[PDB]
Design a protein around this ligand. Structure first.
Ligand SMILES: O[C@@H]1[C@@H](O)[C@H](O[C@@H]2CO[C@@H](O[C@@H]3CO[C@@H](O[C@@H]4CO[C@@H](O[C@@H]5CO[C@@H](O[C@@H]6CO[C@H](F)[C@H](O)[C@H]6O)[C@H](O)[C@H]5O)[C@H](O)[C@H]4O)[C@H](O)[C@H]3O)[C@H](O)[C@H]2O)OC[C@H]1O
Ligand SMILES: [Cl-]
Ligand SMILES: [Cl-]
Ligand SMILES: [Zn+2]
Ligand SMILES: [Zn+2]
Ligand SMILES: [Zn+2]
Ligand SMILES: [Zn+2]
Ligand SMILES: [Zn+2]
Ligand SMILES: [Zn+2]
Length: 375
């Protein structure tokens, strides 16, 4: 965990996946352009044995208009993974975000959610569910021999512990979830593994709502193999005790657990970010390293219940958390990072987070030494 350990290039550092290879795979979320970047390619080859698409396998990326399938970008990630012996996760077959609006239009082009006639509403449910099945069918028929792990549905439970009231749910009810898993199993066969993915899986009432939902679906024969824990977490939240309780709870149902989008933000919520990487104080990296130390000790403790830990990026020079890195300024134009201190204006998404164990110059951080060691 030491800060005495040097800030060496990650391309010269002990391989992260090999450190954990008997405990769980180590994955990274990627964009196709990173496969054209020499340093990113070297990082993926050196440290990772699992891969996921950050964006190009989402519904709107794959079928942006009905009947128009763009597999070109996804294919490049699959090809790279196969050439390098990496597991692949598919993110994601169903989601209320980055989803093409044509799914939810009726035969006359009007939003299905507005329909008041119950017979027309039922017709729209069957149309939506058929479109859903065709989307999944086309994708799974192409990739079933190459992609082992599938985020079949993403974020289907609300933070209020109710089912998320997305158009999927408004139009089709709970059946859209059942149909999605049944279609994946039907066209993909018994060897692909099917996951329900979500964030804040550690937090009540969402955690028990997710638990009750998967328990009921499995009792009804819906094929669900595991839970994907996005794990978009902070230095001091959620607690390791609550993470452990979450993983055990779902393992008790016979479910695999995967950590699918891990990042450890430097900030709280809503974040008050530093404007640049250079401005983040050294102590934050030490606090982060201690958190990573405890976190991966717990993952190892629970390794018989976790098959994969995937980071939502490669190195600190690229992370979706920067889109959340709001910079607060006081009246004198000085940066404000104290979560309830006075401020005058905010520059949304203009700051810099630092969530990984590899820095933006591809050199290892204190968090790397904290999880590569055996203490
Ligand atoms: O390129 C981009 C892609 O990378 C991107 O991918 C998507 C990113 O992730 C997934 O979608 C995201 C997941 O994260 C959700 O945000 C959640 C919202 O809830 C917050 O929870 C609060 C946290 O703070 C707690 O308070 C604590 C209490 O304890 C201590 F006192 C702390 O000091 C406090 O801070 C609150 O109690 C919590 O409620 C989470 O922090 C926050 O992370 C997003 O809403 C969701 O959209 C997708 O799967 C993935 O595809 O997609 C976009 C593309 O451009
Ligand atoms: Cl991003
Ligand atoms: Cl640096
Ligand atoms: Zn390797
Ligand atoms: Zn996913
Ligand atoms: Zn700089
Ligand atoms: Zn990105
Ligand atoms: Zn550096
Ligand atoms: Zn350690």
């Amino acid at each position: 965990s030491y800060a005495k350990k040097p800030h060496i290039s990650a391309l010269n550092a002990p391989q992260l996946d090999q450190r954990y290879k008997n405990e769980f795979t180590i994955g990274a979320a990627v964009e196709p352009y990173q496969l054209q970047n020499e340093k990113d390619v070297q990082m993926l080859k050196r440290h990772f044995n699992s891969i996921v698409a950050e964006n190009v396998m989402k519904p709107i990326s794959i079928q942006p208009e009905e009947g128009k399938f763009n597999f070109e970008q996804a294919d490049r990630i699959v090809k790279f993974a196969k050439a390098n012996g990496m597991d692949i996760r598919f993110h994601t077959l169903v989601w209320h975000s980055q989803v093409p609006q044509w799914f939810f239009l009726d035969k006359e082009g009007k939003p299905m959610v507005n329909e008041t006639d119950p017979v027309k509403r039922e017709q729209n449910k069957q149309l939506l569910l058929k479109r859903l099945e065709t989307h999944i069918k086309t994708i799974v028929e192409r990739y079933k021999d190459d992609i082992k792990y599938w985020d079949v549905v993403n974020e289907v439970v609300g933070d209020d512990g109710k089912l998320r009231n997305s158009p999927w749910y408004q139009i089709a009810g709970i059946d859209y979830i059942k149909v999605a898993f049944q279609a994946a199993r039907k066209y993909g066969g018994d060897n692909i593994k099917l996951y329900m993915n979500d964030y804040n899986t550690e937090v009540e009432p969402k955690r028990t709502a997710l638990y009750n939902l998967v328990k009921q679906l499995k009792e009804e024969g819906v094929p669900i193999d595991g839970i994907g824990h996005q794990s978009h977490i902070q230095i001091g939240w959620p607690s390791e005790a609550e993470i452990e309780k979450t993983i055990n709870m779902f393992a008790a149902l016979g479910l695999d657990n995967q950590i699918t989008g891990l990042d450890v933000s430097m900030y709280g919520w809503p974040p008050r970010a530093y404007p640049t990487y250079d401005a983040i104080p050294k102590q934050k990296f030490l606090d982060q390293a201690a958190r990573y130390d405890r976190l991966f000790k717990l993952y190892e403790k629970l390794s018989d219940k976790i098959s994969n830990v995937t980071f939502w990026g490669i190195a600190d020079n690229h992370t979706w958390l920067d889109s959340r890195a709001d910079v607060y300024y006081d009246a004198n134009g000085n940066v404000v990072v104290d979560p309830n201190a006075p401020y005058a204006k905010v520059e949304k998404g203009k700051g810099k987070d630092a969530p990984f164990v590899f820095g933006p110059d591809y050199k290892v951080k204190p968090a790397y030494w904290a999880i590569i060691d055996h203490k």
